[PDB]
Amino acid sequence: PESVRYIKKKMHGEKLRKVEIEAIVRDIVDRKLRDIEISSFVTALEINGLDMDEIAALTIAMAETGDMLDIDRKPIMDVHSIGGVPGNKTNILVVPIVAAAGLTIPKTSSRAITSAAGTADVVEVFADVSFSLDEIKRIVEKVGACLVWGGALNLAPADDITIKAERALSIDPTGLMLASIMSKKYAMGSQYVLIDIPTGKGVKVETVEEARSLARDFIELGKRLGQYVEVAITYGGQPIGHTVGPALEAREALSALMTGKGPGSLIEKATGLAGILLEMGGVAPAGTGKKMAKEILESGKAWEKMKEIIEAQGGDPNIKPEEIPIGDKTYTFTAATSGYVTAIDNRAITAIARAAGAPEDKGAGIELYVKVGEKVKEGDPLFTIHAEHEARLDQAIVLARRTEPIRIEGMVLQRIGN
Amino acid sequence: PESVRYIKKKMHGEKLRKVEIEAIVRDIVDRKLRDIEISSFVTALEINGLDMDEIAALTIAMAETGDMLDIDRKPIMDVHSIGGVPGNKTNILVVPIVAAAGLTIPKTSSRAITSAAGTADVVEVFADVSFSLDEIKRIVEKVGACLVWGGALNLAPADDITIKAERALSIDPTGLMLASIMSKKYAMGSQYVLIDIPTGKGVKVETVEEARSLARDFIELGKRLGQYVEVAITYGGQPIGHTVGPALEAREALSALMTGKGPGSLIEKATGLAGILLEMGGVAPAGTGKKMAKEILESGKAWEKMKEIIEAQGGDPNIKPEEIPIGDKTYTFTAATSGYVTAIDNRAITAIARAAGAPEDKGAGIELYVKVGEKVKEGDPLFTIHAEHEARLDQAIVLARRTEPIRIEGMVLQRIGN
C-alpha cells in the first residue's frame, strides 16, 4: 500500500496532511496494514511525535472510521478516567449521580489490560456489560444513561489494532493516546466531556505538573473536535475505597450508592466529579455542583437511578450487595509492628490482587481495613486477600510479602548505634 | 592576644593543636577575645571546618573552663533533642519514665529563642526553673532526676558568646554545634546520652540522609568523650502533641503523665525514646525497652516520679493539670472547605504561636484539634489561639491568615478548564 509511503514521511519527521493520515488509518482499519507496518508507524510517533494538527486529524480519522451513534437526548455527557489508581470504582457512582439530574451520560468502559478490575468487569458482576451499539441507544434514551463494555463493539477500531503494537513495544506515545481516548468519545459524539486524572506516585501521571500539561492537551484537543472538556486533577495517594477487584469493588459501590454513605475516597471523588459534570450540564450553577451530587446521592435518588440501569442491563434491580459472592479462599495480614501507616503502594496492590486472579476471577481481590495515616497496633488487619484458587492465594501471598504494600512507621524511624 | 595568631591559622586552613584550641577558648571565656575575634574565628570554621580531632578537643575545652558536676549515682543518663519540632514536651515524659527504672538522669534545658516555648519554659510553669549548680546535685540525688534551666549555670560560657555571632551571622557550623551540644553534656560528664533528631520538612534537619551523617558524627565524637551515645531519627512532619506553648504543653504533658493515656504523637515518642535509654541503661534487655517504658508510664509510676520532682522543684504535686491558667481571650479557625487535611506547617505554627507572644506569656499558645489525615467537614475547628492580651492575638490572627497553617484538600485537587 502506498499508505506506507506516508508512514515513511513521518519517519523522516514530516508533518502529515489530513489526506495522509486518513489513508493510513483507512488502511489500518481495512486490515491492509499488517502488524509490521503499524509497529513502524507507532515507533515513529514516539520518536518523531505529532504536532496538534495531526492529532486532531487522527482522532477524527480514527473515529470516523468506526460506527458512531447519535442520541436524541442532549446534550451528551461523558466521564473518562486516565486511570492508574487501583480500586477506582467511582465512575460507577457518577454516572448514576450525573444521570438522575436527567442529563444524558452514556458511559462505555473497557476491561482492563493492567488493572485488577476493569470498570466494565465491576459492572458485569451485577449486570450485563455487552450490548449492540443499537442496543445502547435504546437504553440511554429509555433510561438516559448506561455502563457497557466498550470493547465488544467497534469504535475507533484502528486504535484496537494499534494498541497491540504499543504494549508489545511497551510504549504509549501521547498523540496516540489522546486520539484513542478522545476519538472513542467522539464516536459516541458526546458534547461535553470531563477527563479525570489520578495524580501521585504509582499513578499513570505521577507529577501534577505533568498532569496539568495533559489537560491543556485534552481541553485544546476537544476544541478541535468542538467538544467542551474539563480536566480534573485527582488525589491518587491511595487506592480509592477499601475494595480492590470486581466483586469487592461492586459490593463497595452499590452499598455506597444504596446507603448514600461510603468511604470518603469514593464518595468525595465521585460527588466532586459529578458536580463538575452538572455544572457543565447546566443543571447546577457554578460552585453548587458538590452540593447537588451529595444531595442527589444522599437523597437516594441516585440509587434509584442506578436501578433503572441495572434493570436495563438485565441485572435484578433489587439485589442486595451484601449477598454478593466472594472467593472462599482467603488470607489476612496482621500488622508486624505497632504504629501508624507511613504509606500504601498502589502498583504493588494491584499486582498483589492480579496474582489472586482478578480480573479473570471476579471473586479475587483485596480488601483494605486501613487507610494512610491510620494508627495501628500489632495485629490490626491491614488487608484481606480473596482468591478462588489455593494456588493463586499462595502465589499472591508471596508477592504480598516481598512488596510490603502497607508500610507502618513509628516516631522513631531509625535507631543508630544500637 | 596571641590567640589571634592561632585563629589566623584557621584562615589558612591549618589544623589546630589542643593548646591552640585551648588557648582560644581560654581567652574567650576570660573575655580576652571580644566580638570581632569570636565572629572572625567562627567564620573560619564555616569556611574551613574541623576534623573530628579538633571538634573533640574543643568540646572538652569549652567544657573544662566551666563548672562541672560529679554525681554519686551512676550511670549518668542524658536525653537531648536537636529540636525544630514544635510542641516537643516529650522530654518531660521521658525523664520521669527513665527515673522510675531508677537509672540516674540529670536534665538541663535552655529556653530557645527560636522556639515558641522552651522545655525549660514548660517545666517552669508547673515549678521553678533555676537552681544553683550545687543544689542540683542535692536535688538529683534525692529523686535522681531534675528539670532545670541550663542558663543560670555558667557552663560552656564560651558557648554563650560564640552564639551571638552565629545568630548574628545566621550560620551554624557543624563542628561548633556538636561542641555546644556535647560539651555541656560532658560537663555533667554524663556516662550515657541519647540524641533526638526530628526529621521532616521545616525541621532543622530536613532529610533523613542528613540525619545519618550527623549521627556518625554525634555518636563517633562521644567515643572521644568516652561517652556511650545513641542517636534516634524521629518524625518531625507535624507538631508533636496537640498543644503548643508552655502552659498548654504543660497541661498536655502532665495530663499524659497522670492518665498514662495521651495523644499518640507524644506518648509513642516519649515511650520509644525512653526505651533506648533503658535498653542503653541495661535495666531492660534489648528490644524490651519500648515495652518496659510503656508499662512504667501506664503503671503510673512515672507520674509519681514526676511527683517527686515538682516537690524538689517547689512545684506542688496535688497540682491539678486542668486548673492551669490559659489565655483569657481566644480565637479559633473553622475549616474553609470540607476535605481531609493534607499537611501542617510547623515553621508557620511557631511563628503563629509566638505571635501570641509565647513564651513571654505562658498563657498564649496554640491548641490543635486536627492532625494530618484527619477528615474535616466544613466548619471543623483546626486550632485555637490563646493570648493574654488582644493586640497580640489580632496580630497573631493576621499572621495565621497569611500562613494558612492547616491545609485541607479534596479528591479533586485542582480543576482545569473551568
Side-chain angles (χ1 to χ4, degrees), chain A residues 1 3-4 6-8 10-16 19-28 30 33-37 39 41-54 56-68 70 75-78 80-81 83-84 86-88 90-96 99-106 108-109 112 116-122 124 126-128 130-131 133-136 138-141 144-147 149-163 165-166 168-180 182-198 200 202 206-211 213-222 224-227 229 232-239 241-242 244-254 256-260 262-267 269-275 277-282 284-287 289 292-294 298-300 302-303 306 308-309 311-319 321 323-333 335-336 339-341 343-346 348-369 371-374 379-394 396-403 405-407 409-411 413-414 417, chain B residues 1 3-4 6-8 10-16 19-28 30 33-37 39 41-54 56-68 70 75-78 80-81 83-84 86-88 90-96 99-106 108-109 112 116-122 124 126-128 130-131 133-136 138-141 144-147 149-163 165-166 168-180 182-198 200 202 206-211 213-222 224-227 229 232-239 241-242 244-254 256-260 262-267 269-275 277-282 284-287 289 292-294 298-300 302-303 306 308-309 311-319 321 323-333 335-336 339-341 343-346 348-369 371-374 379-394 396-403 405-407 409-411 413-414 417:
Chain A
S3 64
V4 159
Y6 308 138
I7 271 185
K8 306 193 52 188
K10 180 51 99 176
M11 287 186 32
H12 310 346
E14 269 149 5
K15 187 156 68 182
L16 296 205
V19 168
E20 276 141 333
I21 290 188
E22 300 253 351
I24 281 157
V25 176
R26 211 171 269 161
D27 294 12
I28 276 282
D30 194 20
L33 288 189
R34 306 182 159 199
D35 304 314
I36 308 274
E37 298 89 352
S39 170
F41 182 52
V42 175
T43 298
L45 312 207
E46 182 81 331
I47 304 184
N48 277 345
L50 314 181
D51 80 0
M52 178 65 96
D53 310 332
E54 289 147 300
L58 198 51
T59 313
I60 290 195
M62 286 194 48
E64 212 75 62
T65 286
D67 302 277
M68 293 183 284
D70 180 352
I76 285 328
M77 305 279 281
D78 173 326
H80 182 253
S81 161
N88 195 20
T90 318
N91 276 359
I92 276 152
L93 275 60
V94 152
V95 168
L103 295 181
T104 308
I105 194 177
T108 59
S109 304
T119 277
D121 311 282
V122 201
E124 186 154 24
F126 59 88
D128 287 300
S130 72
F131 305 63
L133 213 161
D134 303 72
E135 317 211 19
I136 294 187
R138 283 191 261 153
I139 323 283
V140 192
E141 291 173 4
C146 74
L147 289 154
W149 162 29
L153 62 80
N154 164 355
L155 307 182
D159 181 65
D160 284 335
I161 291 137
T162 299
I163 280 187
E166 320 197 49
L169 303 176
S170 169
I171 75 197
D172 184 1
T174 39
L176 295 174
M177 176 178 73
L178 285 169
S180 201
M182 287 316 291
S183 88
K184 291 192 268 257
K185 293 274 156 305
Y186 193 59
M188 295 322 274
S190 64
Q191 284 93 55
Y192 302 98
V193 163
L194 177 63
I195 294 295
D196 152 21
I197 285 167
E206 333 203 2
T207 59
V208 67
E209 75 178 14
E210 172 176 10
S213 178
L214 285 208
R216 291 193 297 274
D217 289 345
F218 271 108
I219 83 173
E220 182 76 10
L221 177 63
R224 289 291 221 284
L225 305 181
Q227 278 156 349
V229 176
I233 301 269
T234 299
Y235 173 24
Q238 60 180 0
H242 305 145
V244 167
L248 295 152
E249 314 211 34
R251 316 177 47 106
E252 198 189 26
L254 306 185
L257 269 175
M258 195 157 68
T259 73
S265 321
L266 189 46
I267 305 311
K269 179 196 188 64
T271 59
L273 294 188
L277 284 161
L278 298 189
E279 300 196 341
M280 293 187 297
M292 222 194 297
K294 291 174 65 175
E298 272 196 351
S299 64
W303 161 236
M306 169 62 87
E308 310 200 41
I309 310 196
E311 191 173 38
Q313 304 298 6
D316 184 1
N318 308 298
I319 210 177
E323 63 185 342
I324 308 300
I326 42 183
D328 283 1
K329 291 51 182 171
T330 59
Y331 182 77
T332 299
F333 282 49
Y340 289 70
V341 198
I344 294 192
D345 168 30
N346 308 292
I349 277 289
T350 285
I352 292 169
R354 266 174 51 92
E360 277 69 345
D361 298 347
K362 321 224 154 183
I366 283 176
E367 169 175 357
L368 319 175
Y369 295 93
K371 91 177 194 71
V372 175
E374 198 189 340
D380 277 7
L382 303 177
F383 61 90
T384 299
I385 295 192
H386 288 265
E388 293 181 15
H389 306 354
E390 303 275 334
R392 297 196 192 280
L393 177 63
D394 304 326
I397 297 202
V398 143
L399 206 31
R401 310 209 70 237
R402 288 153 52 187
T403 45
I406 292 169
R407 222 174 65 179
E409 293 177 350
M411 294 300 293
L413 304 162
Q414 152 183 7
Chain B
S3 64
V4 189
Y6 305 133
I7 273 192
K8 291 175 60 184
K10 196 30 113 166
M11 307 188 188
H12 314 317
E14 303 158 343
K15 185 153 76 178
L16 298 205
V19 175
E20 278 166 337
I21 276 191
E22 296 243 332
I24 294 169
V25 185
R26 199 167 293 144
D27 299 353
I28 294 169
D30 283 307
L33 299 203
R34 290 153 168 195
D35 303 331
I36 302 282
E37 309 94 0
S39 178
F41 165 50
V42 175
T43 294
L45 313 187
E46 181 82 339
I47 315 196
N48 274 355
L50 295 174
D51 48 351
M52 189 89 103
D53 295 334
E54 312 148 325
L58 181 58
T59 300
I60 298 157
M62 301 181 59
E64 285 179 6
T65 299
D67 309 335
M68 293 183 284
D70 180 351
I76 294 169
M77 322 295 275
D78 185 323
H80 182 254
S81 178
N88 174 358
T90 299
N91 280 358
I92 283 179
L93 275 66
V94 146
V95 193
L103 282 177
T104 319
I105 201 173
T108 59
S109 296
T119 299
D121 308 281
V122 181
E124 155 151 344
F126 59 88
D128 302 343
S130 57
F131 305 63
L133 186 41
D134 289 345
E135 299 176 320
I136 291 146
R138 272 205 310 148
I139 311 313
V140 171
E141 293 177 350
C146 50
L147 295 174
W149 177 42
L153 62 80
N154 192 31
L155 276 164
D159 181 65
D160 290 339
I161 321 153
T162 299
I163 294 169
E166 291 173 318
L169 289 177
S170 178
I171 79 201
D172 184 1
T174 60
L176 285 201
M177 176 178 73
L178 293 173
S180 178
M182 290 310 264
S183 64
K184 309 184 54 177
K185 296 292 184 289
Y186 176 77
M188 310 311 298
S190 64
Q191 272 85 68
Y192 297 99
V193 190
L194 164 63
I195 316 288
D196 188 21
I197 281 172
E206 316 219 69
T207 86
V208 40
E209 53 169 31
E210 172 163 347
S213 178
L214 272 189
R216 300 191 296 254
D217 289 345
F218 260 104
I219 74 187
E220 152 69 88
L221 177 63
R224 298 298 221 277
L225 298 218
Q227 293 177 335
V229 145
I233 292 281
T234 299
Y235 165 77
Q238 62 202 78
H242 304 141
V244 173
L248 295 174
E249 313 200 19
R251 324 175 37 58
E252 180 190 56
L254 300 184
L257 277 180
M258 294 178 65
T259 81
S265 321
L266 177 64
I267 307 276
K269 181 173 176 77
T271 76
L273 283 173
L277 288 206
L278 298 202
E279 293 177 350
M280 291 209 316
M292 183 197 317
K294 288 199 66 173
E298 291 171 334
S299 72
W303 162 233
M306 174 45 43
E308 294 176 18
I309 292 218
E311 194 157 34
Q313 304 298 5
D316 155 16
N318 304 359
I319 189 171
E323 63 185 342
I324 307 306
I326 61 171
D328 265 3
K329 176 82 175 196
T330 59
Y331 176 77
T332 299
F333 296 96
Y340 295 95
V341 182
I344 299 187
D345 185 342
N346 317 67
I349 300 280
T350 299
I352 293 169
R354 274 176 53 82
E360 278 68 39
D361 310 9
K362 308 183 179 74
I366 299 179
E367 172 181 348
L368 307 176
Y369 295 93
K371 83 180 194 56
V372 204
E374 183 178 2
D380 282 322
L382 309 214
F383 46 88
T384 299
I385 306 189
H386 282 292
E388 293 177 350
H389 326 331
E390 293 177 350
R392 285 170 174 247
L393 177 63
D394 289 345
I397 306 219
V398 159
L399 177 63
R401 319 179 70 180
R402 315 159 54 162
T403 59
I406 292 169
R407 207 176 70 169
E409 293 177 350
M411 308 295 263
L413 307 181
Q414 157 176 325

